[PDB]
Amino acid sequence: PQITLWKRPFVTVKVGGQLKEALLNTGADNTIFEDINLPGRWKPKMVGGIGGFLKVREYDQVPIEIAGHKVIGTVLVGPTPVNVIGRDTMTQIGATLNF
């Protein structure tokens, strides 16, 4: 797809097999979801740093599908105001900014 930016760029994403909405966010290093259940082993990760740090769960090599493109990526699980697709997942889908 070709996504213009007059509106916030939300997309439907299937993550480890469940349907969620998430923001395509070039200002975010990492992809993060709240309220999903991923199997297997995770590592705790400290993220953020403003006002303190946030603890989340890092899951590696998770299957993720966006606009019919199935890829594999690092997913963080933890609280977040909205779900975020960060640059980590954008490189896997082959997303560029163009102008």
Using CA of residue 69, residue 38, residue 46, residue 24, what is the dihedral sign? positive
Q: Please give the C-alpha separations between residue 63 and each of 4, 30, 39, in angstroms, as whole numbers.
A: 26, 15, 11
Query: Binding a copy of itself by CB under 8 A: which of 1, 39, 40, 44?
Result: 1
Question: Is residue 8 near a copy of itself by the rule CB under 8 A?
Answer: yes
Q: Which residue bears the tokens 């769960």?
A: 57
Question: Is residue 3 near a copy of itself by the rule CB under 8 A?
Answer: yes
For the range 8-13, what are the long-range contacts, defined as Cβ-Cβ under 8 Å and sequence gap of 24 or more?
11/66, 11/67, 11/85, 12/66, 13/64, 13/65, 13/66, 13/83, 13/85
* Closer to a copy of itself by Cβ: residue 28 or 47: 28
Cβ neighbour number for residue 83 with a 10 Å cutoff: 20
Q: Tell me which stretch binds a copy of itself (CB under 8 A): 2-10, 13-21, 31-39, 72-80.
A: 2-10
- Please report, as residue ranges, which positions from 56 to 75 form the binding site for a copy of itself (by CB under 8 A): 67, 69
Question: Is residue 4 near a copy of itself by the rule CB under 8 A?
Answer: yes
Question: Is residue 29 near a copy of itself by the rule CB under 8 A?
Answer: yes
Q: Which residues bind a copy of itself (CB under 8 A)?
A: 1-6, 8-9, 23-29, 50-51, 67, 69, 81, 84, 87, 90-91, 93-99
